[PDB]
Structures are given as structure tokens and as C-alpha cells.
């Protein structure tokens with residue numbers, strides 16, 4: 080997940096790992112999506128199981 | 129040889145002048161079915177006629193003083209430019225006739241010569257005039273042109289000015305925006321040599337200061353309906369309340385009229401000194417749009433007996449002045465006999481309110497005054513030199529009887545004298561002066577009902593960076609009636625329990641608020657990331673602090 | 676500017692009414708300069724006498740204003756397309 | 770025997786614009802030359818005299834110019850006095866035989 084660097088333009092950022100119950104399945108994604116009601120994320124938060 | 133109407137007097141040394149007695153030329157379309165003819169100037173400028181009288185007053189004051197340039201006489205040759213390049217170019221070609229005759233080797237054989245010219249008002253007109261005046265090394269002293277492109281001495285070899293350039297105004301506007309804690313603004317500039325470099329300088333400074341600019345548009349005096357409507361649509365589609373305008377009254381009036389007719393209110397205008405005191409924009413009918421403007425003003429000077437000289441103008445006594453006839457006719461709305469009524473000729477000029485004598489401070493007239501005295505004192509320095517102490521090859525002195533233009537320019541380059549206000553006047557290596565700035569606010573008069581300019585601070589250029597700006601906030605009305613500072617940020621501040629977010633395709637000034645995960649906390653009012661909790665500790669439910 | 680002042684000698688003499696040589700050729704048109712800064716300075720003087728000027732290298736967009744430059748013509752495109760093409764090239768290679 | 774950019778070139782790009790600039794004026798003068806009465810661009814359809822032509826008449830004829838060059842294409846100026854033209858993209862290499 081993209082992270083803000085203060086005092087710098089938008090083209091320069093940093094990456095942060097998504098939380099335990101959320102996932103990110105793209106590249107250069109600015110947010111982590113939540114799994115559905117009866118789904119939980121796996122070890123790499125790249126998909127819901 | 130030259131234009132028809134002019135102000136002229138005879139003397140041993142002749143000075144030239146260019147003043148905008150008219151606001152512009154007729155908006156005619158050019159078709160070449162027949163031979164083109166002279167274009168006409170349309171709108172009268174009462175303020176520009178007062179600037180002309182300052183030069184004549186200064187010359188007559190020098191000619192009557194035995195202590196300055198004794199036994200010599202100063203003449204003048206003043207033309208009208210109508211803030212257009214072509215008229216000024218015709219006048220300049222009238223100025224340099226004698227030098228050009230020998231330059232081209234192409235009759236009269238006896239014509240008066242000009243040693244110096246008091247410059248123009250606009251920066252483009254000044255550039256065009258200087259390009260031709262520097263060919264023959266004729267010095268030119270300007271009183272209102274402040275473009276930073278005119279400081280280049282490789283191209284403008286004989287240009288001097290008695291006004292500071294436009295770097296400090298851009299820096300001061302950035303300082304004001306930083307002072308009032310705004311980070312979301314828009315910009316509008318005039319498409320000429322005055323607005324573009326100034327707005328570019330403002331753009332650079334602000335970026336260094338982490339200020340986001342939403343839109344940037346260019347305008348002109350001869351813009352059509354489509355461009356004006358596009359600019360108006362751009363403005364009202366934005367959520368930025370503060371707009372910085374680098375331009376003049378003639379170049380800004382159409383956009384202001386179009387905005388006024390649409391009733392667009394709630395904007396905060398930052399004004400440059402070109403239109404911060406203009407009477408074309410400071411109208412009572414526009415106060416619900418432009419009320420509460422903050423702008424810059426130059427320093428004021430004192431001329432002890434200027435108003436008495438101003439009040440003595442007459443169309444039948446001013447033989448040497450050719451603009452007084454039209455001044456009288458425009459002032460009293462009558463026709464002078466060689467359907468308006470015939471002018472009686474004994475009508476007081478105090479009855480009719482015009483910018484001619486309805487002023488509070490002398491700012492540009494003082495610049496004209498100083499421009500005349502600079503040339504006078506350079507001539508005096510030429511006159512009172514001794515052999516072996518000259519500035520020329522072997523210490524020689526130029527002859528006062530046979531003086532030449534380049535010698536006067538050389539002596540102007542080394543000028544150092546005191547004025548009637550007790551201060552010193554020297555031009556730097558770029559031919560520039562330094563001066564303070566004043567900050568004004570647009571109010572509404574309770575009794576008269578007109579617009580009143582009120583000073584609320586100043587800008588000090590002789591101080592160091594970061595301590596130049598002074599503002600007294602208790603004297604500011606933010607729209608003519610309000611007492612609270614407006615909000616002009618892109619988005620609200622994220623609270624202490626959240627952090628910042630990224631919006632795709634948008635600048636850094638606009639963000640979202642996202643809560644902190646369990647086991648983390650933040651304690652700032654704008655947090656890029658949610659900080660973790662120390663070992664053997666856990667975050668509170670609100671994630672405000674660890675427990 | 677020195678070379679241009681000799682192009683408009685007869686017209687300038689007629690305009691100022693100063694009036695000698697009795698034989699001065701008149702220039703119909705001028706093949707413009709190379710740089711844009713020189714072209715503007717030359718056009719400011721030529722447009723006074725409505726003398727056409729055709730430039731071959733100047734490509735600034737400031738010369739497209741017909742309120743200021745009445746008799747200026749070009750055989751080369753201006754630079755707006757060039758700037759757009761540079762932006763397109765930068766976007767193409769990511 | 771001496772290598773100078775005078776005759777060391779592969780294409781004519783800017784020197785071709787001067788050629789076209791001269792032919793533009795020449796064709797404007799030619800169009801002045803063959804003006805039949807009643808079909809002029811001036812007042813009441815009158816034409817100008819080629820023996821006593823003036824600069825503003827040539828400017829008026831230049832503003833309404835539409836002719837063909839030696840390559841078969843059309844040449845005409847827009848309302849701003851400009852033209853339209855294709856661009857070419859090039860890359861800087863090194864000659865192995867010479868350097």
C-alpha cells in the first residue's frame with residue numbers, strides 16, 4: 080500500500096504492508112481492501128480465502 | 129516633424145517624455161481594401177495628465193533656481209503613447225532623427241537634439257522604446273516599468289528606472305500566503321512582459337513554500353467573449369478562495385465586469401500595485417465582488433507646491449501645453465469654439481470630481497519628479513567638474529556647451545545626490561532603485577459611499593529573510609464586513625486518531641483520513657503514518673495514545 | 676535594427692515630413708530573421724509602414740498575435756505542437 | 770577539398786524554407802500581375818498597378834495566397850500567418866568508419 084512522504088510530490092512514495100484482515104491484489108495500489116463478510120486473508124495479503 | 133498635439137518649449141537642453149494621456153486605441157479591424165490611416169485613441173486618462181504636469185513643474189522649478197544649473201534653460205518635447213507600441217515608436221523615431229541621419233548617411237541640416245528621455249509606463253512599451261534608444265546611447269529613465277527583463281544590461285545598454293523591480297512583490301505575496309496559512313490558491317496574469325515573469329517568479333517561490341496552485345490563466349485587454357467565458361468557468365469550477373492577480377486595470381476590466389454580472393462572491397483577491405489603486409476596478413458597483421481586496425502600494429513623497437500649480441491650468445493660458453484643450457473639454461463636457469454647449473472659459477476645476485486633484489498620496493508623480501532631478505543633477509555634475517578630476521580617459525571634462533548623450537549616461541551611472549526628503553538616490557549596476565512597500569485594504573466609506581484604501585501593514589526590503597512582513601490583523605475586513613480569516617485549504621486536517629491518505633491524480637495538498645490499526649497510535653494533527661506501540665504496550669480504543 | 680532602419684528610409688522620411696538624396700529604393704517585402712527575439716524587434720518597426728515580412732526559422736507563439744504584429748508571416752510551424760509531442764514522447768516510454 | 774557545413778549535408782530543411790518564402794512573394798506579385806478588371810480585392814473590385822505597386826497591396830495579396838510548390842503540394846497561410854507541418858524524430862549514432 081502506498082505511503083505519503085511529507086514535503087515531496089506525489090510521484091515519490093513508500094510501500095506499507097496491508098493489515099492482517101485486508102488484502103491488496105494490484106500494483107501501485109493506494110489502499111488495502113477488506114475481505115468479504117465470511118472471508119479472511121491468507122499469509123501474503125494478496126487474496127481472500 | 130512628429131505627432132500633431134504635444135507639449136513643447138525651447139531651451140539649450142531638451143528633454144523628451146512619454147505619458148499615457150489615453151487608455152488605448154480604437155478597436156478597429158484591419159482590412160486592406162484602401163490605404164491604412166492613423167488610428168485614434170479613445171478613452172481619456174486623467175491620472176496620466178497629472179503625471180505629465182509633474183515633469184513640467186520640475187523643469188520650471190529647476191529653471192527658476194540659481195543654485196542648480198545657472199544660466200542654462202531646459203526645454204521639453206512630450207508626446208502621448210496611448211499605452212501602444214506604435215505611437216511610442218513614432219515618437220521615438222521623432223526623437224532620434226538627428227543621430228539616425230548620420231547613422232544612415234541619408235533636408236533640414238539643423239534640428240534640436242535630445243539628450244535624455246523620461247521613460248514610459250508599460251514594460252512592453254519600455255522594451256520597444258529602449259531597443260531603439262540604445263542604438264544611439266541615449267539614456268532613458270522610467271518611472272513605472274518594473275519588469276525584471278529590463279535589468280539585462282547586455283541588451284538594454286542605457287535603461288534606468290526609479291522604481292524597484294517585481295521580485296520582491298512576488299516574494300511578499302508568497303510570504304503573505306504563508307503567513308495566513310493557506311495552501312490552495314489560483315493565479316491569473318496579464319499576457320505581456322509585466323505579468324508573465326512576475327507570475328513565474330511567484331510560482332517558483334510558492335513551491336519552495338509547499339503551496340499548491342490549482343489553476344493558472346492568462347488574460348488581455350483585447351480578449352474576446354470565448355476566452356473570458358472560459359476563464360470564468362475555470363474560476364467557478366474550483367474550490368480555492370484566494371486568487372493572486374498580476375496585471376493592470378485595462379487588462380483586468382473585462383474579466384471583472386463579466387464576473388460582476390454573474391454575481392460571483394466570496395473570493396479573496398491579492399492585488400499587485402498596478403491595479404491595487406486603479407479607479408477602473410475600484411467602483412462602488414463592484415464592491416460585492418472585489419470588496420476586501422489586499423494589495424501593494426508604493427511609498428509616498430511630498431511636493432510642496434504641486435496642487436497650486438495643478439489648479440492653475442487653463443485652455444487659453446497654457447500656450448506650450450497641447451493637451452489642456454482636450455483636458456478642459458473632457459472635464460467639463462463642453463466644446464471649445466475655434467451638440468455640446470460652448471465652454472464659457474471661467475469654470476472652476478474644483479467643482480468636478482476627477483482623479484486630477486482627487487488624490488491622497490503622490491507615488492508615481494514623485495517618481496517623475498525624481499526622474500527629472502536625476503538628469504538635472506547629472507548635468508550639474510558635468511557642469512561643476514575640474515580638470516584632472518573627470519571620469520573620462522585622462523580625467524578630462526566634457527563641455528557643458530557641447531554636451532553629448534553618452535556623457536550624460538556615463539555621469540548618470542555614477543550619480544549620488546540627496547533629494548528634498550533628505551534621502552540619498554543612487555542607481556545600482558543594473559540601474560535600479562530599492563524601496564519599501566505598503567499594504568492596503570479596500571473598505572467602504574460610511575458617509576460618501578466610495579471605496580477607501582486603508583493601510584494595514586508594510587513590507588521591509590532592507591531587513592533579512594523571514595522578518596520583512598508586518599500585518600495588523602485587527603484593521604482588516606475580509607469582505608468589507610467580516611472579521612474572521614477565511615478557510616482556503618484543499619481538505620480538512622486529519623485528527624489525532626487517524627492518518628493521511630492518497631487520492632489518485634491529485635496533488636499532495638488534498639488527502640483523506642484513515643484510522644489507525646489496532647496496536648498502533650498517532651499523536652499529531654497531520655500524520656503521514658500511524659506509529660506503532662512500544663513493546664508490552666497496547667493502543668487505546670480511540671488510538672490516541674498507548675496503554 | 677540598424678539594417679532595418681535602412682529598409683524604411685523613404686517611408687520614414689515621408690511620414691516625418693522632414694525630407695535630400697532624391698534616389699532611395701523602396702523595399703516591398705523582407706525575408707525575416709532567424710531568432711524569435713530578433714524577429715519581434717524587426718516586426719515592431721516594419722509593421723509601422725505595413726511592409727510584409729516572411730520568416731523562415733522563427734517559431735515562437737508570441738508572434739501569432741495580430742493586434743501587435745500586423746504584417747508577419749511564417750513558413751515554419753510554431754512550437755505548441757513540439758511541446759505536445761515532447762509530452763507524448765515522455766508518456767509513451769512511461 | 771575542405772569539409773565544411775557549406776556542402777556537407779544530407780537534407781535541405783531550413784534552406785528549403787527560404788526558397789518557399791521567395792516563391793510566396795513571387796506568386797503574390799504574379800497574382801497582382803494578372804488581375805482582370807472587376808475581380809480585384811480592393812474597393813469596388815479594382816486592381817493595383819504592377820508598375821507602381823505598394824507594400825500594403827502585396828500584404829493583402831499575401832493574406833489571400835493559395836498556390837502549389839515544385840513538389841506538388843499546396844501552400845497557403847492561415848488567419849494567423851502560420852503553417853502546419855509534419856515532424857521527424859531522430860537519434861544520435863556514431864559512424865564506425867569515420868567516428
Ligand SMILES: *[C@@H]1O[C@H](CO)[C@@H](O[C@@H]2O[C@H](CO)[C@@H](O)[C@H](O)[C@H]2NC(C)=O)[C@H](O)[C@H]1NC(C)=O
Pocket residue numbers: 306309310311615617619620621653
Ligand atoms: C491549512 O494548511 C496549512 C498548511 O499545512 C496548515 O498550516 C500548518 O499547520 C500546522 C498545524 O499546527 C503547523 O504545524 C504548520 O507549521 C502549518 N504550516 C504553515 C506553512 O503555516 C493549516 O493549519 C491548515 N488550516 C486548516 C484550517 O486546515
Ligand SMILES: *[C@@H]1O[C@H](CO)[C@@H](O[C@@H]2O[C@H](CO)[C@@H](O)[C@H](O)[C@H]2NC(C)=O)[C@H](O)[C@H]1NC(C)=O
Pocket residue numbers: 563564586587588589590
Ligand atoms: C522601510 O520601512 C522600515 C520599517 O517601517 C523603516 O525602518 C524604520 O525606520 C524608522 C526611521 O528611522 C525607525 O524609526 C523605525 O524604528 C524603523 N523600523 C524598523 C522595524 O527598523 C525603513 O527606514 C524604511 N526604509 C526607507 C528607505 O524608508
Ligand SMILES: *[C@@H]1O[C@H](CO)[C@@H](O[C@@H]2O[C@H](CO)[C@@H](O)[C@H](O)[C@H]2NC(C)=O)[C@H](O)[C@H]1NC(C)=O
Pocket residue numbers: 106766769
Ligand atoms: C515508471 O512509472 C510508470 C507510472 O508513471 C509506470 O507505468 C505504469 O505501469 C503500470 C504497470 O505496467 C501500468 O498499468 C500503467 O498504465 C503505467 N502507467 C503509465 C504512465 O502508462 C512504470 O511501470 C514505471 N516503470 C518502472 C520500470 O517502474
Ligand SMILES: N[C@@H](Cc1c[nH]c2ccccc12)C(=O)O
Pocket residue numbers: 249250251272273274275322376377401402403406
Ligand atoms: N508597473 C506597471 C505600470 C504601472 C504602474 N502603475 C500603473 C497604474 C496604471 C497603469 C499602469 C501602471 C508595468 O510595468 O507595466
Ligand SMILES: N[C@@H](Cc1c[nH]c2ccccc12)C(=O)O
Pocket residue numbers: 709710711712732733734735
Ligand atoms: N527557430 C528558432 C531558431 C533556430 C532554428 N534553427 C536554428 C539554427 C541555428 C540557430 C538558430 C536556429 C527560434 O525560434 O528562435
Ligand SMILES: *[C@@H]1O[C@H](CO)[C@@H](O)[C@H](O)[C@H]1NC(C)=O
Pocket residue numbers: 544545552554
Ligand atoms: C553617496 O554619498 C553618501 C554621502 O554623501 C554616502 O554615504 C553613500 O555611501 C554614497 N553612495 C554610495 C553608493 O557610495
Ligand SMILES: *[C@@H]1O[C@H](CO)[C@@H](O)[C@H](O)[C@H]1NC(C)=O
Pocket residue numbers: 835836843845
Ligand atoms: C486552394 O487551391 C486548391 C486547388 O485549386 C483548392 O482545392 C483549395 O480549396 C484552395 N483553398 C485552400 C484553402 O486550400
Ligand SMILES: [Ca+2]
Pocket residue numbers: 086087335336338
Ligand atoms: Ca517540498
Ligand SMILES: [Ca+2]
Pocket residue numbers: 190191192193194195196197198199200
Ligand atoms: Ca537654473
Ligand SMILES: [Ca+2]
Pocket residue numbers: 633634
Ligand atoms: Ca492532474
